[PDB]
């Protein structure tokens, strides 16, 4: 109630070499109305990308019903789609991470896990590996919360701290003679970019039995991921990169992430608000905030970002009709390499 500051630990190896590190902290629930115009304000604003604090157009989908005072089910309900402006959300632009490495700029953004009335913000910070030599403690302000960035130098030459051991993610012929496999944590963000090489759902159609025709008119872009808190960015999907296809499988087989609430009912919404017909299927629920409320509409080459507090967007692709893809995804993938 009075406790408002949280620590965000970011681990650093002793030796530093396109590598970016990531830290995150899940903040306590805050009222949904107070998340409007909420933007991260960091002390170290002298070296952060200026585009994250800019406005990204979202289609907001909420549900609201009427029920008896002691009832969990609803006598009636409806959904409302509105165009809202959200700043500071984890909308990464094309080559923003690469430009930030050569520019020594941080990426500070947040994810939103909301029900109909409250939101759990998850604050992320992506810094180049060059931020692990100075290891200067930074301060980020997000709404009513204060976050202290704490850099800890793990005991490993370049690798990842995994269960008290140091694992270096890798290969090829050398791997056959000897190798080891480690389960490594990964965070992914969808980068919306039009392009003949970024037609993502052409590979969704090939990897999965998903009956998905007319991939030309579906969202274009890729996911960018940082593994072990220290690696070069992995572009997802990449057909000849088995690590990339492992992340690709986890994103679309476990779209809500790898980690009570009672379903009130399915609903459809117009995305964007100006759409002539319903374009997105969702499931209205009651329950404490759980999974991310941020997603991107599937059936639009230009990314239509959706914010659906209290609704679970259609993430299945057995029918690409009125579906969505997650904005963020966290999970574990198995990587070859060695311990040091």
């Amino acid at each position: 109630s009075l406790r408002n500051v949280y620590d965000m630990k970011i681990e650093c190896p002793h030796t530093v070499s396109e590598n970016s590190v990531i830290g995150y902290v899940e903040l306590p629930p805050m009222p949904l109305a107070d998340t409007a115009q909420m933007v991260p304000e960091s002390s170290c604003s002298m070296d952060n990308h200026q585009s994250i604090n800019t406005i990204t157009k979202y289609t907001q989908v909420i549900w609201r019903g009427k029920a008896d005072p002691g009832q969990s089910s609803q006598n009636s309900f409806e959904t409302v789609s509105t165009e809202v402006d959200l700043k500071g959300t984890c909308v990464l632009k094309h080559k923003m991470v690469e430009e930030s490495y050569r520019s020594r700029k941080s990426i500070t953004c947040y994810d939103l896990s909301c029900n109909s009335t409250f939101c759990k913000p998850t604050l992320y910070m992506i810094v180049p590996i060059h931020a692990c030599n100075m290891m200067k403690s930074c301060l980020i302000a997000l709404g009513p919360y204060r976050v202290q960035v704490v850099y800890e130098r793990t005991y490993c030459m370049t690798g990842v701290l995994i269960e008290g051991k140091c694992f270096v993610p890798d290969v090829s012929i050398i791997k056959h003679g000897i190798f080891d496999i480690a389960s490594v944590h990964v965070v992914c963000f969808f980068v919306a970019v039009k392009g003949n090489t970024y037609k993502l759902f052409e590979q969704v159609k090939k990897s999965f039995e998903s009956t998905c025709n007319d991939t030309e008119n579906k969202v274009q872009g890729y996911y960018i991921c940082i593994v072990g808190g220290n690696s070069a960015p992995i572009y997802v999907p990449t057909l000849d990169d088995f690590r990339s296809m492992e992340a690709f499988t986890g994103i679309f087989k476990s779209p809500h992430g790898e980690d009570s609430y009672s379903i009130v009912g399915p609903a459809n919404a117009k995305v964007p608000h100006s759409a002539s017909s319903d374009t997105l299927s969702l499931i209205a629920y009651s329950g404490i905030p759980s999974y991310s409320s941020l997603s991107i509409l599937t059936s639009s080459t230009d990314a239509k970002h959706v914010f659906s507090p209290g609704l679970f967007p259609k993430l299945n692709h057995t029918n690409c009709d009125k579906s969505a893809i997650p904005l963020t995804w966290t999970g574990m993938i198995d990587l070859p390499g060695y311990y040091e």
Partner: antibody
Amino acid sequence: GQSLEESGGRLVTPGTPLTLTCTVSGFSLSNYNMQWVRQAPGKGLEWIGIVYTGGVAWYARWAKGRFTISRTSTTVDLKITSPTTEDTATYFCARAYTSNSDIVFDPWGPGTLVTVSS
Amino acid sequence: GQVLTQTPASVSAAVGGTVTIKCQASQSVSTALAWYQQKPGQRPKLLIYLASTLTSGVPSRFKGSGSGTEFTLTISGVECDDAATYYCQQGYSYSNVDNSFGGGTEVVVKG
């Protein structure tokens, strides 16, 4: 029995760097966030900045570049880089009312008086 | 950046009567508002943290209320000891803030 006591208030000519110190009794300084607040005679309370347990200082928009807040094991500092006659006030030191918090501040020190004139 | 506005600048209340002073925020501060009492030549004294929670030793004659953008402080059965200047302070956000305290309100007790 927690208390604070500022030190260093004195008469200085304009432009002369001045540092104010806030000694702490009755509690561990490592567990609380601290703030400096000044009050010109007859005027209202003016927030200056907050120093968090991680050592980073967060200042008010007008105070940016004119003040510096720093933290040690047992003291909290406030340096006026180049005082002007408008800086004459009583400067207060305040502990955050609870740990891991910066919402509200208690207890307060008696304050120390800074006078800037030729 | 939130700006706290207090009205009126000065109020006069009779001994044993009731006085109400208001604090207004430019942007929402939810429940993170506080009320300080300060007498001349004395350090600020915290009376209410959060919207309506009294600190230890503060009489029940002091109560606070409000949420989001409008807050009030009321003193019932005001004594001569209650004559002071009262400041509201928000702890919701310190980003782009010129002053976490409002302009203050002095209450004169009519004896």
